[PDB]
Amino acid sequence: DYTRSLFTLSGPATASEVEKHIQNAIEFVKRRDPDQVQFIQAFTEVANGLAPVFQTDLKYLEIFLSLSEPERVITFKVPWVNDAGKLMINRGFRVQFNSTLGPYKGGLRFHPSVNLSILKFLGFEQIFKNSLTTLAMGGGKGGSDFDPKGKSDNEVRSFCQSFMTELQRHIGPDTDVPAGDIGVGEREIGFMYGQYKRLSNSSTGTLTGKDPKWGGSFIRPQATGYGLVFFVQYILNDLHNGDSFKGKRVAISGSGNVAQYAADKVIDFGGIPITFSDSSGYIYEPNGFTKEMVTVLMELKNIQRARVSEFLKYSNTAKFFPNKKAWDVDTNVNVALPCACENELDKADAEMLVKKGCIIVGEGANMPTTPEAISVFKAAKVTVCPGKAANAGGVAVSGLEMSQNSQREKWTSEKVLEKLQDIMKNMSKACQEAAAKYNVHGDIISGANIAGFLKVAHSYCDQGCV
Template identity: 50%
Template sequence: MDYVTRTLDGLRRSSPGQGEFYQAVEEVLEVLAPVLDADRRYQDEAVVERLLEPERQIFFRIAWLDDQGRVRVNKGYRVQFSSTLGPYKGGLRFHPSVNAGIIKFLGFEQIFKNALTGLPLGGAKGGSDFDPKGCSQGEIMRFCQAFMTELHRHIGATIDVPAGDIGVGQREIGYLYGQYRRLNGRFEGVLTGKAAGWGGSLGRREATGYGCVYFAENMLAERGDTLAGKRCLVSGAGNVALYTLEKLTQLGARPISCSDSSGTLIHRAGLDVALLKDIKERRRLPLRDYLDCHTDATFIPVADYTAGRSPVWHEPAELAFPCATQNELTGVDAEALVANGVVGVCEGANMPSTREAVSCFLRAGIDYGPGKAANAGGVAVSQLEMQQNAAMARWPAEKVDQTLRAIMRDIHRRASATAEEFGAPGNLVLGANVAGFRRVADAMIEQGVF
C-alpha cells in the first residue's frame, strides 16, 4: 500500500463521516504524490499527517433568544488548522448545512489558498448551523452576540482573525465585532469584512468576485485571449456572484445567468447588474423579481429543474464561474459546458466542482481555475485590511484594487509556473496544490516539530 493510500485510510478511520473533508484531502494528496515521493523530507517529517490534523478544533453550544422569547440552541465551530505562516485566517459560515466535516474541508482548503497569496496567513474556518434566512434583525444580532461570547476567548489580532462567508456579511460582522469589543475592551483588527467607516477596507466586499475575474483574465491572457465579448455563466446571487458579475461587465464580458435558492435567472442579452444588486443586496428579494423590469429574461424555479440539475450550466457560453457552494457543478454539468463551447471555468466558490467535473475539464483541456487559487481575492484583501488596522491607516479604493489585481496575477503565475515545472503546462490544479503545499510544508520543517 503506497503512502497516499495509507494516509487516506488513516484519515477515514480517525475522522469518520466527513465526506467533503475526504474529497478535499484526496484531491490534494493525489496531485502531491510525485512531490512526496521525490522529496522524502515531507514523509520523514510527517508533514502531511500534521496538516491533516487541525492544531485546534473548538466546538461549542450557542444558546440565544428568538423574538418570542424562546430559547434556541445551535452548534458553533472554529477549526484552527495551521498557524505555520501566520495568524489563523478564514471565514465564518452560518448555514443549516454546516457541520464538522464541511468546516474541516473549508479550513483545509484555506491553508493552501492563503499560502498561494504569498501573504503571512495561516488557515482556519468556522461557523454554525444557524440559518439567518427568515430571522429578524434582532434575532440575528442576538445570535451573533451569543456566538462571539464563546468565540472571543480563542481569537485575536495576531492569533486568529475570522471573516465572513455564506450567511455572514457586513451586518453580521458588525454584530460580532461589537460583542468582541464589549467583552475585551479593545478596538483591534480581530475581524475582517468590517464596514469601511470603522476599520474595514474599501474593496473588501468586492474582493472575492473581482479577484475571481482577475484570475480568469490571467488564464485567458496566457493563451492570448481576453474577456471582451465572452458570454459568461455565473451561479449564485450572493456577494461573490454579484461582484463577479459586476467585474465581468466592467471588463467587457457578457454575463447571462445567475441563481439563488429559488431558481435560475437567464438573460441572454446580458444581466442588468445594477438591478440585481438592488434586488439582492438592498431589498433582499428573490431573483424572480428581476422579470418585473426585464420581460425578455427567463426565470426557472427549482421545482422545474430537470433531474434536480441547475440549468445555469446548460446554456451556450464561453466561460463559467461557479460562485454558489460546494459540489454544485456535477460531471453531467461539466460535460454540457464543454459540449456547449466553454473554454474556461473559474471557481468563485470553495470546491464547487465535483471530482467528476474536474476530471472532465482536465480531459477536455480547457482552462480551469480551482477555487483555492481563483477565489483567493477575498482573503487577500482581508489581509490588506489587517495591514491597515495595524497601521491605523485607510487605503484608497484604487490602491486596494491595484494590489488585489497584482496578487491574483502572482497567484496565477505561481500556479502556472509550478505546473510547467512538473511537466503539466496549464494544469492549475496541480500547480496550485503543489505551490501552496510546498510553501507551508517547507516552513513547517524549518520551524521544527510542535
C-alpha cells in the same frame, strides 16, 4: 534542507507506492478520528491532489500528515438566556489548525449542523486557500451549533456576547482573526466586535468583515466576482499565450453578488456577458449585457428579490428560457463562469460548452463543475480554474482588511482593488509555475493544490516543524 533527519519517509517514490502510502496515511487519520467523515474525506481529497509532489519526495506526505493535526482546538460551553428568560447551552468551537504563514484565519459558522468534523474539514482546507492568497495568513475555523433561524435580534446578541466572552481569550490581532460564514454576517460580526472590544479594552483587527465606519474595507461585496475575473484574465495571458477576455462571449450562471460583479469586471476587460441565471431559468442577450443592464438586474434581484424573467420588461432584446441552465444558450460561448451553486455544470453541460467553443472555465461558486465535467474539459484542453483559487477574492480582501487595521489607515476603493488585482496575478503565476514544475503543465487545478501546500510545507520546515 535542515530538517531532513526528522522525517522517517524520504526520497522519490513510484505512483503505486505513493497510492499505498496515501492509503496508510488515511488509515492513520481514521484511527485517530474514526467518525469524522467530512474531515477524513477532506484529508483524502487533498492528499490525492498532492500525489505528484509526494512522488518527488516522500517527506512531503509526512509533513502533510503532520499538518493534519490542529495546533489547537478549543471547544467551550456557551450559556446564554433567551427572550423567554430560559438558560440555553450551546457548544462553541475554534479550530486553530495552522499558524505557519500567519495568525489563524477562517470564518465562524452558526448552524445546527456544526460539529468538530465539519469545522476541521473546512479549517484544514482553509490553510491552503489562505496560503494561495500570498498573504501572511494561517488557517482556522470556528462557530457553534447555535441556530440563528427563528431567533430574535436580541437573542442573537445575547448569544454572540456570551460566545465571544470565551472566544476572546484565545484570539487576537496577531493570533487568530475570525471572519463571517453561514449564520455569521454583519449583524453577528458587529455584536462580537463590541463584546471583544469591551472585554479586551482595545480596538484592533481581531475580526474581519467589519463595517467600514469601524475598521472595515471597501471592495468586500465585489471581491469574489472581481477576483474570479482577475484570475481567469491572468490565466489567459499566462497559459493561453496573451489571450484576454476582450471579444469573448461570457456565459454567466447565477444572479447573486458574485455573478453580478463578475459581469461588471468582464465588461471592464472588454468581454461580453450574455447570460444570467436563477432557479427559474436563464436570460440571454444576443449582444450582451451592458453595465446599465446589470445595474437594473441588481435592483430587481437584490431589492425587489424578483426572478430573472422580470428583466424582459426592461430590455426589448432580452430573451428568457424557462427551466434551463445558462449553458444551454444556443450561441458560441468562449468563457463559462459558474457562479451559482455546487455541481451546476455536469458532463452534458461541459459537452455543450466544448461544442460551442469555450476555451476556459472559471469557478465562481464552490465545486461547481462535476468530476465528469472536468474530465471532458481536460480531454478538450479547456482550462479549468479551480474555485479554491478563482473565488479566493473574499479571503484576499479579508487579508487586506488586516493590513489596513495594522496600518491604522483606511485605503481608497481604488487601492484595495489594485492590491486585489495584484494578488490574483501572483496567485495565477504561482499555480501555473507549480503545475509546470511538476510536469502537469496547464493543469491549474493541480497547480493550485501544489502551490498552496508547498509554501506551508516549506515554511513549516524553516520553522523547525513546531
